[PDB]
RNA sequence: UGAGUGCAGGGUUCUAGAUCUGAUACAAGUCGUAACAAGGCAGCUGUAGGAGAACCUGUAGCUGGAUCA
RNA sequence: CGCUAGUCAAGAACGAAUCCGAUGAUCAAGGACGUAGGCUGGAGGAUCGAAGACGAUUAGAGACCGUAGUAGUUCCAGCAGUAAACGAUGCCUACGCUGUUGUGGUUAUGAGCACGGCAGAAGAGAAAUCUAGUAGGGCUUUGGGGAGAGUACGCGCGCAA
RNA sequence: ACCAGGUUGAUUCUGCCUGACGUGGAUGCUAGUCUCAUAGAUUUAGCCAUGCAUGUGUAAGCGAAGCGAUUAGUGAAGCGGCGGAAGGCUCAGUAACGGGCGAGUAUUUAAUCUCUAGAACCGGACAACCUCAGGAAACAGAGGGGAAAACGGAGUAAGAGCAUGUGUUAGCAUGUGAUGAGAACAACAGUGCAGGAGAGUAAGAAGCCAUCCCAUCAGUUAGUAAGUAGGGUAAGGGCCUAUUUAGACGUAGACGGGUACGGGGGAUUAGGGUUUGAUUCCGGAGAGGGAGCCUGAGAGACGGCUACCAGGUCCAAGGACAGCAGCAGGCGCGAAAAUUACCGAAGCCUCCAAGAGGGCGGUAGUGAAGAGACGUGAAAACAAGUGUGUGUAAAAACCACAUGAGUAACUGGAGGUCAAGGCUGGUGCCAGCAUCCGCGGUAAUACCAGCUCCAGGAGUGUCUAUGAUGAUUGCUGCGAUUAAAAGGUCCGUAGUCGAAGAACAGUACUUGUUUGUAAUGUGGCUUAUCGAGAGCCGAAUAGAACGAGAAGAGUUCAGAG
């Protein structure tokens, strides 16, 4: 049926391709994700930014290039993903940095997720018990609880994250 | 009288054109009676309906051209 | 009833067309009014938007204008002499626009006699008026406007129409 | 359809009204009146949105049953009455006065004014006719009619109206160097000064304009109202004086020009 | 029922023929080729049985459910 | 202005029918053996006769022939 | 399309300082020709020989082989419209390596122009081989896994086939 | 912007079958929590029990009975006024004014706006009221009063058309004239109604351009094509009729037949494409099938009327009534689709209204059609429960605090394609399995089971259409010596295609400016714990208006051949 809402995953063309199976298995294992759908969701997000960079570099006009480059780079800096010293009002560096985006990887999006941040900031003994503190309300940000492990943490929120003891 | 108008239509898939035409029946007045004939080109203006098929009237014409009935030199030169 | 739509009409290429609607009132027609000569009888018809139209069934008289001398008079109508569309409307004496009619000439005779040049300007009209012949043409639409009005035939108009009457 | 239309679906209503798509299926169908339906707004949208003074239909009723609201000097009692451009709105209690104008985006907006500006409006001249008893008349864009005005006023000029007497006060014509306001098109709500006019036959005249901060833009005469005797404007315009910026310009102005 | 033709259908499972009586109602299904075509080694048969008396034949054969009776 | 209904015809789509005649599948039934080797008369294309049946015979052609001579 | 003379029209190629000036390429519909075998009428009838009849050979031969024998095989006036009608390679127009051998004209005797054969090469192609090399030049015909099927129904031509 | 298995004793090719992946319906087995969408379209535009979906009154049109009164009052039966022509449902018919873009006439328009703008007398009835009183019911009679801003007449303003001057063209002058009206009331301090001229809204008719398959459908048409004159209409016009002229349309596909609600848009997609559109927006048509119609500003109306045909319902047998392609609901038909639920609240529409009405619309209930975010433990310490408050029209859910606690996985597979066992027991070409290739004749990693593994996971298998796979439909981009495939040879029309040199012109061609897109989609930003979601911004297709450039295309010339 045709109805509201987008679809956020793309199914792989070959269901039993051995190099894909092994490399996916590793990354789910290491990062403590629920199933293959969590991973595929991040992959589509990553692809979208790569497409924008491609389009910008090949555009003929200057007005669009100067306008939309800035927006793309600023956004990815705020998420804490693309960390480099982009200088504005300088055409060459904008081109240089756009080229550096083109080999961005899903690992970089994964490491901004709250489940990984909690463990990485040494507030939990494993990526597993980090998830188990996001459930059951033990994790709090700016004085308010966050129930969802997929919460992507912007650059500089790290000062305000906290854990509290269990209710028992 | 019957006037033909001609034009080209672009077919997107094959990236090429086809020739087309349409027939329009127009009113000719007695003031033009001897002057306009087959092959000539004519300018017509729009009006309210005159009959089942007729909506334009001939308002003037451009006569199918002759540059010159070419010169013949005198035999004396 | 009667319709003015082109539902039933063929295409210009000679082919038939299919019907895609039942009839609509906004293209209704009405039966002809056949105005006869006689004592006045006129009917009032309620028309679109609540307007009124006046339909003459029988008429006795008309206003008739003289164009050269610039006066108008009111006179009885005798009979139709000629009708351009159909020979039948003449023999049954039906009134329409462009019908040519015989009328009482005496009022016109009394007025035109005042001009000392009258005989010299139009001898054929003068002769007709002596012989008791007086002819006019109707300009109004009796079935629409509810009355008949016209002008007296003079000069070359007489010369033209009199040739249509003669056997 | 067997007869005249009564309803108006929310997705079909003018983009100038700026109403939220998701809340309900209908919108108010303006009553017949001064301006066209495409160039005006019903009064109940003004009181609930543009200038918030009611929040429910019961309150909208009450305000007008008590006879509070005055438009062009007359008290109004139809909630669906249309108001248009250059159209003084007022509440005599608390002595408030407003004109109706466009945002730079082309939406409608109310602008607060003093009791001086509240005395006049501007319209455009559409036709001239002589009427039974040999009486000259003139007519304007918003269905206005005027008896024994100055005969020299020409079709296409713009006229200033005194709201209390309902007479014409001043007249201005379409010439080089005068101030113009933009009613419809790509550049709604812009304000500028005439560079040059190119005359066309049997078709609209093309007018070329310079903006106050340098930008040229041209449009057809049918979208322009002339809003001053020569140099400078009659009516007071918005907090921002009708300058429109591209997203490109907004970026340059925010982060600085691209250096060599 | 829908055409008043009489057709041949195949009965899939191990003991499947025992789950059907004469004058039972059955629902019938396609074999999965592009046109209606024979599949495997069965000559000239073009459909297979799916349900008997409103219940799944797979459940009947494997004794997970019983006849409506 | 016309609904309905008489009587003849047409145009479409389905369906019945004594009997005849095609095709396809026939584990392997009966009679021969026409083709593939110079397959035991080299094969094949057109046309015309004939014949249980493959096919056979006259006439013109072709090599994809058993001969690049 | 193959004996010799005489006669009657038109065409191809070659030589060259003749004339006219875009008159041209390809082609549904429409029209003319088309080996052999066949058909309608006339002439004729040597040789060969479908059909038909015998003699042998074989389990059986109705066939192959031998004896005999008719329609046809020839000519004039027509109908018909198919072939392994094949170099199984559409028609105009290009760009393209060498050696050798023909046919007809012309020649500074060095060569050319039109129509061919042959042998390598380089490219090409699944190979065999090359009318198949290079290529978004123009226009028409035409194929889309085997079978059923070039068959059924309708239609057009033909005396019939 | 991608491949794999399958003709042979092996090989290299042509070629088709099958797998692997989106999406629309149907269905098996299994199912913890919360949020956003959507549901008798496909078959029968088949048939329908019941209840509801359209009515409205003020200080201010007329006011009967009743009640009551020192000649007051009341409170309203009917009449009048305004609406019932919108919205809701469906896709039968239509190859067309059905669809896109421009333009504003040859037209009519209750309400509403601006300017302007009204000295008028007389008479009956109809309904309700009162007295009889019919009929099985549905529905009606006699007789007698009496009102209006209801209705008909009188005068009177006004006044269509016709003719001539003058200003196209209003206007004015003059002659002639059919027709022929009109509302006030209340003071809580206002509300109405007559005439004009211009607007505003809505239709009717028109201009240009685009539109499906069959040639085993090649000729079609005679109001057909046109002219003159008249009738008719709100209005142009063969729209209709009389006499004259023979036209109009076709191989660039006429005419006939089959099929179809049309767009904005949807699905797939590197690009070029291929498929669909009953279905939130716009426009069209219908109300069992056909046809006629009154009233009105507006209907050829069906929750109006009238007749036939097909079907029904009640009767006292004489007659009456009725039409769910509105909302619930029932029966059928099918492989196929929810509650005879609440609603002085949100968005809007209707009236004579500080109020009344609305199944239009909103709120929940039901269902693994679709789309988000999360449970099923951690190494010290875990959903779903419950109670208060909130929330709403009232609710439930959601959220806040406080109490208990310790519950929570299945579907398809394991010989190759294709991830994962020659494990143990039965069966012996049986029973079965297998999209394809193939397994089983007593030593079956392939059947039937046990046990371990694999894949996705609140989900997974199957069937059926379609897009991709596919350069197996080829514009980009395939083939025709032998694999399927160049007409036996010429002539030839329509069609498609056509030198050099010197000049010329602007309609195609390309481009500027201006128009032309609500939703959806595209580039962004901001707020619901997060993410779909919601809100605001910017640019945009095809199509049209006006300019510009002249290479290619086009037209002409001859001291060129």
Residue numbers in the entry:
A (entry chain SJ0): 2 to 169
B (entry chain SL0): 79 to 155
C (entry chain SI0): 2 to 168
D (entry chain SE0): 2 to 261
E (entry chain SX0): 72 to 140
The study reports:
The ribosome is the central protein production hub of the cell and conserved throughout evolution. By combining cryo-electron tomography (cryoET) with subtomogram averaging and single-particle cryoEM, we investigated the structure of eukaryotic hibernating ribosome dimers in the microsporidian species Spraguea lophii. We show that microsporidian spores contain hibernating ribosomes that are locked in a dimeric (100S) state, which is formed by a unique dimerization mechanism involving the beak region.
To obtain a detailed structure of the eukaryotic hibernating ribosome dimer, we fitted our atomic model (determined by single-particle analysis) into our dimer map obtained by subtomogram averaging. This revealed a 100S particle that adopts a conformation that is entirely different compared with its bacterial counterparts. In contrast, the eukaryotic dimer interface observed in S. lophii is located between proteins eS31, eS12 and the 16S rRNA in the beak of the SSU, within a connecting bridge between the two ribosomes in the dimer. This suggests an entirely different mechanism of dimer formation to those seen in bacteria. In addition, the beaks of the dimer-borne ribosomes are bent towards the large ribosomal subunit, in a similar way to the structure of the MDF1-bound 70S ribosome isolated from E. cuniculi. This movement of the beaks closes the gap that would otherwise exist between the ribosomes in the observed 100S configuration, thus transitioning the dimer from an ‘undocked’ to a ‘docked’ conformation. In the 100S hibernating ribosome, the P stalk is located close to the dimer interface, where it may form interactions with beak proteins eS31 and eS12 from the opposite subunit of the dimer and thus stabilize the 100S complex. In the hibernating ribosome dimer, the P stalk is orientated towards, and may even participate in, the dimer interface. This appears to lock the usually flexible P stalks into a fixed position—evidenced by the fact that it was resolved in our dimer map, as opposed to most single-particle structures of individual ribosomes (including ours).
